[PDB]
């Protein structure tokens, strides 16, 4: 069901039904303009809006620039038929994209259903359609009809990016606020977009590109569309309600103009700048408006201007307003239904929910001022998809929100000149001296709300009745509730396109007069006694030219000289950059600079003295002159001593009133009403706690959190300035060299920029964590305790009042007064803790660790897995996979690739050319589970063969093998090579690596050592800091290339390739995740399976193996040795692993046919004595904590206990066998106990008592060894 | 003092050298403070002294060196005169490297090694025999290189790690000296207050009892610092081996393999009974490269120091003061402590055990069922951090403030009582300061994982229910809470299930709580809405995650019966397994869904993927049950790679995967 029923072209002939000339309401008269009906009562006018408002009849830019941070002006846009066709295609495409998601589908259904009410009648008993809420569609024959429509999309006004809603009001009413509504004209331009900067997502995606991102135009259209939808239902907040902002101080911005409707529409943290008092005020006001409309509908008698039946119109407006019909047909506004509808229209259809559904990167708060203008094109599917936007799937653009980057995906975004030029609306900040003055943009300054926006009725006393109801909790909106409402949303009902009487040929209508907003002062000059964040950040700026620039820690000189840049780094960094570098060591000098940058910017200072703040970032101190003083240690000590108060530029002026006492109305001779009254008193006290906490939370969000986000953005700007100045100096040094020298060095600035941006990204994730901790600490320590104190005073007051109340009613309640007294005392003596996660959903631990594992698995540039029936990449790139004919897959686990020493047994991975490793500095990691059989022939000695090859023209990386060795190799372009080896010797009794599954991991930090981890723990590391440009192979080959042995093969699985150097704990988590803790293992590492004989081993005494003394009731099982040894000289020498009796796992409580053993499986265990099976049975009637364990005839087991519970823990491929009887009694874990000189097999509860594990307890850890060809020893 | 030169130059023999800047500064700040007349001021002073000492001693800083991330312990510079010239210990440790921490730094000498040249008698040998002899020579050479590496390892130990272990022992002795000095200060202040104050005698007795526990905690913090310095210096020594010994071994072995390759190549070129192509084959087959003497293994170098003594110390000083274990033996039920400490348990013998989440749980009537855990640490005190966590499932509805568990001697201590439908945590100190907190929605016939963490260092009280930080308070205004050694589990007036009771002597962070919660929950079991264990042949009722308030109803249409929600008789759901020996439903297993009608019926998927109700016993196909470990009990039903999800409004269930993930989620009750 596509949103648009047909493809529309601007050159299509008029039809009078969907494509036609139209005349919109206007002040005077104008010529009809071509327009296209895309959906029911939704029209599109591919023309610049110059006629809906006579005040804007000129497309020339106004003499005064708009008070908007981002602006653009051109007239030739949307002047040609081709451009208008492009506009129509883009509008239709964005409408389809919005309709694709469920939220957009609901919004569009409501938009179509939200027909403006008919209020153009002076007669109260007749419903007359308002003239300004219709259109004049010219039929082809010459006549014209009048059609009622809800929404009309039109071209932009003089400012192209000034997307706004317009409408025509009635004679005296305000249709956008009285519940009537009016036709909406949206000045939308799908051919342009804004350019902002996002930083809070470095936590989730640590590979964000530099430069500015581009807003998905579908998001902007959704915002404008829901604004128009609020207009349609007549519940728009009055524009006179503006969030007031303080301005007097220097650090304060010159001004800001945001409506409460804009904050309502944005959602998220913007929707919480409004206290619950004003929210309830608006809800009740619009409830009254809806009840007025219901009353007007009730007093209706007939219709005017159409042939439609009265019942039809009743049903239409009932469906629009969700009114209730009684048996008599009277309409009333149900409180519940209006509440649900208002929730749907206001706190559900927000831009934040649309950003959640589109899965795109949009600025979370309106304070994230957009920075640039980008011309785009969205109709070409190669540039923009319905379901994906700029982030094309299965491409480089899909990953890391790269498709919205305007420096990487540069073919899809064209930078434009911003007419709001630098230092147009700004403030001048001067430090007294000469008085050093700088210019700081208006939207570059701090935003502080006025206290008037925060009004509460807490000081108002409240009277409690028996029938008083307690309001439900104000839960945050999540996708769960959005899907809940989508499930019950009725998409079948649609408005009928009824025919109404013809209106005037020239419709007369006047657009509603919005209040005139006074421009805030411009050019205002300040004076300071010291620098600030603004002066310090400006001191980090520079100019592009031919003059050598130097990094100096002195801010004053940097301000005094544009050729000198202030840096918050150490003197070593400035000495290194400043000193002239000769041609020879330029590359080494650049490497040193990169290392110093990535070290100092990622510097942390963990502390434990303070409660919640864990880490500190010292260089924040000198970076922005945060707080005062100069020394970094001074800042650290000050932050330890005081806390987050130093960070904030202004101390919030929190004012919590004395809580209004509760007055209880006395009820006489009614115990039920009295107990109900006191219960309601306690419940209202709890609600009072909740609402004062909510008020303090909103105050903190409006007054403190914004400061912290501004500081975060300024720190990001500081880091970017540092990188840009350093790179400019490096570029100047490189340009000083001769052309031949430049040819000698393969120095690419792009790789340097990527490395520095990634280091800045890590520094920024650190800064984000620090600032989040500081903000939450200030909220918990300097705002909540005041509210807690007021609540405690209120609790004492109400406690005394309720004690008096129950005293006064001693006759009414006889005997149950002590209960009431103690209940009141207990309930009022407790506290309700401030759980921040109840009010803001940004601080959930589950989200944190889920994002941690998601970043572990989804940052892989190659996640090769076998699913369904094919092996393919599962990452964001879905690279090409070619499978040779002789590549075997394990039937029991079809993700375990096997590769032989054959030419047609290979897996070739064709990578996207944007991810192939060609970089001098980029870190990267790889990981895979490998299984290498024991070498048998002496030819294997000194025979190294590559297994995973990504080496091209003697350059790249390769995982290679050798006798008892696993080698990782790198070779850059200059042919110099570095390898790191894990050596495991085969001359050992029992080994953890020979023919065992091994979790190999390789992490390559081009500034540090490349290291190889085995089974999650570091094994080797070699320095690779000197290696130059490594250009890996475009393809990656999975084949044994060089092994002279014919029968030599490897097993490999879960090959993942990541673009960052995994840290130790990430490697540990990878190991313990991919280890499949839900499934038991055998000795080698394969999944433990039923009906598969295994030899037994004990971890405590490997040299001994299991044997039966005799079969029968009196028999038992025991351990005996020596294990023996299989040796082939100079190749291998190991204990014989195929000795002793064999064990078989038989299904007892397995509910599926899979032959896989999982945790806590109730099974039977059989012992193969002389190729005959017996049950591993025991009797619990024997004394002693350790009870003997024997082998018994299967039909003769009887009532004896034989249940074995299989337990897997995380490791040495161990398996724990608990013993239980038919009654589910833990008769104990299976191990061995020494009696006389025989180590018999017993079951004991003493193992259960030990939980400290490790030493001593380990006796209970068994291992199953199936007959595997890798070992190859004869049985 | 803070000047070793001045300490020695102090002719009065009064000062004593120390390196605890926080404690020294705190003592300097209260130098002009008023005298401590009462026990409250003594508690404040003792707590502040303990906290300053623990922040001085146990503090460590992670630094990135040429070897990795290392826990540099900063006070060693002021403890062993190691690089005091620079501004800080860490800056010198980085700008000078690990090798600067010792005196004699160039100590490695090349072992005297002899390698037998290839015998000449092999000249008249056939190709196969010559190749076999060359293979034997290759194996012996590899073994000899390994022996040279072992000799180098022993040499590095005996020469370089001897100095670092001298540093280790000296630093441990310095820490013990500082601990003894601090205990001297504490005892002299306590004795002076006993002898020269008007404090009540019982207050003096409680002060002595509390000061004993504070001294024990100071000992524990000293042990923490000793372990920190030990691990730091062990890592530094291993990194010294990395950066100083191994390159020398590599260079010597490179020269040795070069010479041996030259000799073997000359010997092969001198052989007479070998063709030219076979000569080239043998020459390239018996070469030596870096792959043969690349014996470096970090795990073995860091596993040298592992020992049985370390394991015994680790388990003896284990933070687990109490970890209740319970199981059922034929004849009786065993309940006790599994922490290895001296905690005694006295429990009423009428307490049954029923399976809870992962293990057995004690069932409490609420009237006569009592359990008492005796342990010295349970007395608590002024400056001991601890943590209490367990699984609680209430089976009561009493609003009265009824005691659940805690240690309360003479109104002093900590406790947790049932109250309303939730819990109340109460902490009362001797001075009367009370921390009283209320937790909502806890008593719901459902399992909740309750954790309390009292951290006296940062003075932080953390309370988690399930896996949410339900409370984060400051106990900076709570002094000595000395209580009885007995912790009593009574659960007054509310029969309940209590599982996995655990008391630690260490504060717990959020990550540990989340890890424990998911670790216990993720035991391959399917849980219904009640957090219990789902089972076969039990009459459940199905609910959706999105529509948990809305049950599933059965209704007849199109000569069939279909199940749907309403935006209707509620359907009854059961799960069936193939084997009649299975009771509970484990993760990743086959299920047949059954509905109890007048005659029992099973589920099936029709052509349109709708969920149809059938009567045939064998026609019903087997679905697969799974879930996510991140979610406690929101299970998912799948079939052939396609789950079961809520359909569009028309609301039945469909087997489609072109919708949101929330639609696949389900629950049972």
Write the layout of secondary structure elements.
The structure is cut from a larger assembly and holds chains A (1275 residues) and B (669 residues).
Chain A: E1 19-23, E2 33-39, E3 42-45, H1 81-100, H2 102-113, E4 126-128, E5 134-138, E6 144-148, E7 151-154, E8 165-166, E9 184-187, E10 192-196, E11 213-214, H3 217-232, H4 260-266, H5 276-298, E12 302-304, H6 310-321, E13 324-325, E14 331-332, H7 335-348, H8 351-358, E15 372-375, E16 414-416, E17 426-431, E18 436-441, E19 462-464, H9 479-488, H10 533-538, E20 550-552, H11 555-560, E21 564-566, H12 571-578, H13 586-600, E22 605-606, E23 615-616, H14 620-624, H15 632-641, E24 662-664, H16 671-736, H17 739-744, H18 749-808, H19 817-829, H20 845-858, E25 860-867, E26 870-873, E27 880-883, E28 888-889, E29 896-899, E30 907-910, E31 918-919, E32 924-931, E33 945-951, E34 956-962, E35 965-971, E36 977-983, E37 998-1004, E38 1009-1014, E39 1017-1023, E40 1030-1041, E41 1050-1058, H21 1064-1074, E42 1094-1098, E43 1105-1108, E44 1117-1120, E45 1126-1128, E46 1132-1134, E47 1142-1147, E48 1161-1168, E49 1173-1177, E50 1186-1188, E51 1190-1192, E52 1203-1207, E53 1216-1220, E54 1226-1235, E55 1238-1244, H22 1246-1249, E56 1262-1266
Parallel strand pairs in A: 3-7, 4-12, 7-9, 19-24, 20-21
Antiparallel strand pairs in A: 1-2, 1-5, 2-3, 5-6, 8-9, 10-11, 10-15, 13-14, 15-16, 17-18, 22-23, 25-26, 25-41, 27-30, 28-29, 29-41, 30-40, 31-40, 32-37, 32-41, 33-34, 33-40, 34-35, 35-36, 37-38, 38-39, 42-47, 42-56, 43-44, 44-55, 45-46, 47-48, 48-49, 48-52, 49-51, 50-55, 52-53, 53-54, 54-55
Chain B: H1 4-9, H2 21-29, H3 39-57, E1 61-65, E2 68-72, H4 89-96, H5 127-195, H6 201-270, H7 276-285, H8 298-303, H9 308-316, E3 320-329, E4 332-337, E5 344-347, E6 352-355, E7 360-364, E8 371-374, E9 386-394, E10 402-409, E11 412-419, E12 422-428, E13 434-439, E14 448-455, E15 460-465, E16 468-474, E17 486-489, E18 496-504, H10 510-521, E19 542-544, E20 553-557, E21 560-564, E22 569-570, E23 573-576, E24 589-595, E25 601-605, E26 611-614, E27 623-626, E28 636-639, E29 642-643, E30 645-646, E31 653-654, E32 666-668
Antiparallel strand pairs in B: 1-2, 3-4, 3-18, 5-8, 6-7, 7-18, 8-17, 9-14, 9-18, 10-11, 10-17, 11-12, 12-13, 14-15, 15-16, 19-32, 20-21, 20-22, 23-24, 24-25, 24-27, 25-26, 27-28, 28-29, 30-31
Helix pairs in contact in B: 2-3, 3-5, 3-6, 5-6, 6-7
PDB class: toxin
Keywords: Botulinum neurotoxin, Progenitor toxin complex (PTC), toxin
Entry title: CryoEM structure of BoNT-NTNH-OrfX2 complex from Clostridium botulinum strain A1-ST7B, major class
